[PDB]
């Protein structure tokens, strides 16, 4: 929220509007967008999504930013958006800038195989086990696609928001949490106490990266992609990683 | 690095194995499999000069459009994970 | 038809000659499965001269290729590139002369229409050709005895 006395956004923050009010968006993705735009030299308008957050297929119809990409209300959608076959099918995606994916975040008390099926069934273990993830996610859709039982069981353990999901992990009443690997790693690094850690080496299955939406085969397309690898090409991403992504935790281990 | 260069991969791994050379630098995909193969030798640090592999096609050929479309479909189901699991043994090392 | 080209890289490709006329071994993966295999024509250093030699090749990339082949309408015939190198720009000064030596060069030349191998993906190459989404992704590292 921008300083009311100032009346307009400050520093790195770039304006974004949400139909319901001007909100000020800033961060890693914002800086990357700014650099890409700077390199390709174009101007752009940024706003916030209302309906359905991250893109989701419900029954026949899609939701989220992807809708505004399909409705041509957005040309390109930017964010923490993960990549999947369906969305790559409907819209062309930028190359992944960061190593991420599905992953687990748990307290120091579990799955070395990490496919051990201890997750597959809670019931095999006499005490009830617990793990959950945020709904309407690429993670949840993927889960439902490959592993049904896990979805049907985890619906009870689904949580409202990442801060709240964190509330279920942190205060007890939940054992394990599952979410995006970049977010889980940054949260591993950033915690009020170093009470939370990643799973194994944090080496994630469903190895993926964050992409960016475009309409279809007709688009600025390749021009974007080049820009992206110029960003790492000059080594900026490492600096931006140290500033935005690097957490203080996990130094110790 | 230019000093004391080796001609081929086998000789380069051998030097470290022979202990002729204390360290060897190469991309992981060739190296990690060997790391599993001996375990007398180890890989260290974080992959740098990160580069992803892929199947080459001319821009003019549209089949690649399906290929990527297929590649992604192969990623989601964990087909790749099981294939790396098969071909990376992975038998003895830690 | 698809002409496919590869290079001899140990993890993702293996080379053994077909025993006499007989084709491929029933050798089995550590997880009990029979190993799949296909025929590939490639450079042989075994003979003093270098003939393009009929060979048997089996690999991760091969299993992937056949996986595609069941998924995709295509049929495949594979021969390894004559040069051991995948590819690099080289050769004469005037205008731009020749072309990068190696399997990539075969791709532009059309000797093979598609390249299946462990190839890192980079911009210098990228302008010349289309690149499939990465099946894998690795980087450089160092080996030292434990």
Curated annotation (Swiss-Prot), chain A:
Extracellular topology ranges: 110-253
Residues that hold L-glutamate according to the record: 82, 87, 138-139, 180
Residues the record marks as carrying a glycan: 136
Tissue: Detected in oocytes.
Cysteines joined through disulfide linkages: 9-24, 16-25, 194-249
Subcellular location field: Cell membrane; Postsynaptic cell membrane
Family membership: Belongs to the glutamate-gated ion channel (TC 1.A.10.1) family. NR2B/GRIN2B subfamily.
Subunit text: Heterotetramer. Forms heterotetrameric channels composed of two GluN1/zeta subunits (GRIN1), and two identical GluN2/epsilon subunits (GRIN2A, GRIN2B, GRIN2C or GRIN2D) or GluN3 subunits (GRIN3A or GRIN3B) (in vitro). In vivo, the subunit composition may depend on the expression levels of the different subunits.
Described purpose of this protein according to its UniProt entry: Component of N-methyl-D-aspartate (NMDA) receptors (NMDARs) that function as heterotetrameric, ligand-gated cation channels with high calcium permeability and voltage-dependent block by Mg(2+). Channel activation requires binding of the neurotransmitter L-glutamate to the GluN2 subunit, glycine binding to the GluN1 subunit, plus membrane depolarization to eliminate channel inhibition by Mg(2+). NMDARs mediate simultaneously the potasium efflux and the influx of calcium and sodium.
Domain writeup: A hydrophobic region that gives rise to the prediction of a transmembrane span does not cross the membrane, but is part of a discontinuously helical region that dips into the membrane and is probably part of the pore and of the selectivity filter.
Protein name: Glutamate receptor ionotropic, NMDA 2B
UniProt source species: Xenopus laevis (African clawed frog)
Gene: grin2b
Residues of the full protein shown: 418 to 802 of 1448
UniProtKB/Swiss-Prot annotation, chain C:
Glycosylation, residue list: 44, 73, 93
Family statement: Belongs to the glutamate-gated ion channel (TC 1.A.10.1) family. NR1/GRIN1 subfamily.
Gene expressing this chain: grin1
Subunit composition and interactions: Heterotetramer; the NMDAR subunits are modular and harbor tiered domains that function in concert to regulate opening and closing of the cation-selective ion channel pore. Forms heterotetrameric channels composed of two GluN1/zeta subunits (GRIN1), and two identical GluN2/epsilon subunits (GRIN2A, GRIN2B, GRIN2C or GRIN2D) or GluN3 subunits (GRIN3A or GRIN3B) (in vitro). Does not form functional channels by itself.
Residues that, per the record, bind glycine: 118, 120, 125
Function: Component of N-methyl-D-aspartate (NMDA) receptors (NMDARs) that function as heterotetrameric, ligand-gated cation channels with high calcium permeability and voltage-dependent block by Mg(2+). NMDARs participate in synaptic plasticity. Channel activation requires binding of the neurotransmitter L-glutamate to the GluN2 subunit, glycine binding to the GluN1 subunit, plus membrane depolarization to eliminate channel inhibition by Mg(2+). NMDARs mediate simultaneously the potasium efflux and the influx of calcium and sodium.
Location(s), subcellular: Cell membrane; Postsynaptic cell membrane; Postsynaptic density membrane; Synaptic cell membrane
Domain notes: A hydrophobic region that gives rise to the prediction of a transmembrane span does not cross the membrane, but is part of a discontinuously helical region that dips into the membrane and is probably part of the pore and of the selectivity filter. The extracellular N-terminal domain (NTD) is a site of allosteric regulation to modulate overall receptor function.
Lineage: Eukaryota, Metazoa, Chordata, Craniata, Vertebrata
Disulphide connectivity of cysteines: 24-56, 40-57
Protein origin, superkingdom: Eukaryota
Protein name stated in the entry: Glutamate receptor ionotropic, NMDA 1
């Amino acid at each position: 929220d921008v300083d009311p006395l100032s009346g307009t956004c400050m520093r790195n923050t770039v304006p974004c509007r949400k139909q319901i009010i001007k909100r000020c968006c800033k961060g890693f993705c914002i800086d990357i967008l700014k650099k890409i735009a700077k390199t390709v030299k174009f101007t752009y308008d940024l706003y916030l999504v209302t309906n359905g957050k991250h893109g989701k297929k419900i029954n026949g119809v899609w939701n989220g930013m992807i809708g505004e990409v399909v409705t041509k209300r957005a040309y390109m959608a930017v964010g923490s958006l993960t990549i999947n076959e369906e969305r790559s099918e409907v819209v062309d995606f930028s190359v992944p800038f960061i190593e991420t994916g599905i992953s687990v975040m748990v307290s120091r008390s579990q799955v070395s195989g990490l496919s051990d099926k201890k997750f597959q069934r809670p019931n095999d273990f006499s005490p009830a086990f617990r793990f959950g993830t945020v709904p309407n996610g690429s993670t949840e859709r993927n889960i439902r696609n490959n592993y049904l039982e896990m979805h049907s069981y985890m619906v009870k353990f689904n949580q409202r928001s990442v801060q709240d999901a964190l509330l279920s992990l942190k205060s007890g009443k939940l054992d394990a949490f599952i979410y995006d690997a970049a977010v889980l790693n940054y949260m591993a690094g950033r915690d009020e106490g170093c009470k939370l850690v990643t799973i194994g080496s944090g080496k994630v299955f469903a190895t993926t990266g964050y992409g960016i939406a475009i309409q279809k085969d007709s688009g600025w397309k390749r021009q974007v992609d080049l820009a992206i690898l110029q960003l790492f090409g000059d080594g900026e991403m490492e600096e931006l990683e140290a500033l935005w992504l690097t957490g203080i935790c996990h130094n110790e281990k | 690095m230019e000093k004391h260069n080796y001609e081929s991969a086998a000789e380069a791994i051998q030097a470290v194995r022979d202990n002729k050379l204390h360290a060897f630098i190469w991309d992981s995909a060739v190296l990690e499999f060997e790391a599993s193969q001996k375990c007398d030798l180890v890989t260290t640090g974080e992959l740098f000069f990160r580069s992803g592999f892929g199947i080459g096609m001319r821009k003019d050929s549209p089949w690649k459009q399906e290929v990527s479309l297929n590649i992604l479909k192969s990623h989601e189901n964990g087909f790749m994970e099981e294939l790396d699991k098969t071909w990376v043994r992975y038998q003895e090392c830690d | 038809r698809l002409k496919i080209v590869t290079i001899h890289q140990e993890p993702f490709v293996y080379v053994r000659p077909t025993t006499s006329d007989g084709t491929c071994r029933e050798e089995y993966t550590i997880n009990g499965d029979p190993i799949k295999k296909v025929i590939c024509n490639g450079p042989d250093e075994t003979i003093p001269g270098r003939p393009t030699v009929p060979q048997c090749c089996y690999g991760f990339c091969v299993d992937l290729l056949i996986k595609l082949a069941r998924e995709m309408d295509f049929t495949y015939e594979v021969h390894l590139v004559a040069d051991g190198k995948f590819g690099t720009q080289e050769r004469v000064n005037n205008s731009n002369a020749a072309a990068w030596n190696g399997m990539m060069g075969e791709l532009l030349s059309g000797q093979a229409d598609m390249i299946v191998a462990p190839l890192t993906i980079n911009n210098e190459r990228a302008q010349y050709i289309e690149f499939s989404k990465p099946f894998k992704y690795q980087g450089l590292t160092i080996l030292v005895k434990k």
